[PDB]
Structures are given as structure tokens and as C-alpha cells.
């Protein structure tokens, strides 16, 4: 019962965290390091984020400079960005990567508000699915006699309580992306 609850609050935590990233990889607003965090480049057989492999430097609002902490991960990172979802054709000079935002337009931005709202929805669907796997556990606890209806019923209500908190936590994360 208690470990079921603990295992869930824990898993929703990770969903909210993955959410902040999804929503970060979107700039309703203007250029910043956060957008580059969802991108990953095979690092020694492990999918690693560039936001830890390089310094995302933002001079202008339409210009980002990327110095990979290691020279040899440069092309690797550079390619991860033209292949990403930002819509950029990163440049290279041997050490640095020159990225040109674009500035955006009245319409695409709207198509990114729809997007941010839509990926916050995926994340609330993931949460409710965590909440549901936990239910089938609390349900299976009660049925095995590892706990009385009384104790498990309480957990059900506590399970639901927590879900809303993590859901509202995703709500007031897409709120900022308006």
C-alpha cells in the first residue's frame, strides 16, 4: 500500500520533470538554452543531452553559440540540432556551432501554443496511467488480503489526491507557455 503510493508519487515526479523539458523545447517567446535540452547525441552508446555536453550561449534573440565541452562531440551535436524539431541549420567552424533561430511568425507561434498544450496533455495522460497502474496494485492488494478495504480505500483517495497535484503542476507549466 505505502510502497505503491511511494512508487507512484515518484513516477509522477518524473513525468512532470519530463514535461518541463518537452515544454522547454518550445520557445513561445524567444531563444534560450532550455530549448536544446530535449535533443540528444549518442554519447559512448548512451543517449546524452547536449545541455550537459556543451555551453549554449545566447548573444542575440536570434543567435545561439554552442561550444561543445569536447571538440570530438561537435559534429555529433551539430547534427543532432539540424535533425531536431527546432527548425535550424546549425553551422560549424571547428570549435563553435552557429545557430540561427528565425524570429518566428504570426501563425507558427500559434501552432506552438497548440503544441505546448498538446504535449502537456500527453504528460497528463502518462500521469493518469501511472495512477492507474497503481490502482490495479491497490486493487490487487485488497483482493489478496494484504490489507482490508478500509486501509486500501484510504490509499485510493490518497492516490487520486496526489494525481491532481502533479496534473495541476503540468497545468501551471503549460499556463506559462501561452
From Swiss-Prot:
Q: List the SUPFAM superfamilies hit by this protein, alphabetically.
A: Ribosome recycling factor, RRF
Entry-linked InterPro entries: Ribosome_recyc_fac (IPR002661), Ribosome_recyc_fac_dom (IPR023584), RRF_sf (IPR036191)
- Where does this protein chiefly localize? cytoplasm
Name the residues that span the membrane.
none
Report the GO molecular function annotations: ribosomal large subunit binding
Q: Kindly state one GO CC term assigned in the UniProt record.
A: cytoplasm
> Which Pfam family is one of this chain's hits?
RRF
Q: Where is this region: Disordered?
A: 143-163
Keywords, sorted A to Z? Cytoplasm, Protein biosynthesis
Keyword Cytoplasm applies: yes
UniProt-annotated location(s): Cytoplasm
Gene Ontology BP, a term: translational termination
User: What family, per the record?
Assistant: Belongs to the RRF family.
Q: What does this protein do?
A: Responsible for the release of ribosomes from messenger RNA at the termination of protein biosynthesis. May increase the efficiency of translation by recycling ribosomes from one round of translation to another.
> What name does this protein carry?
Ribosome-recycling factor
Q: From which lineage does this chain's organism come?
A: Bacteria, Bacillati, Actinomycetota, Actinomycetes, Mycobacteriales
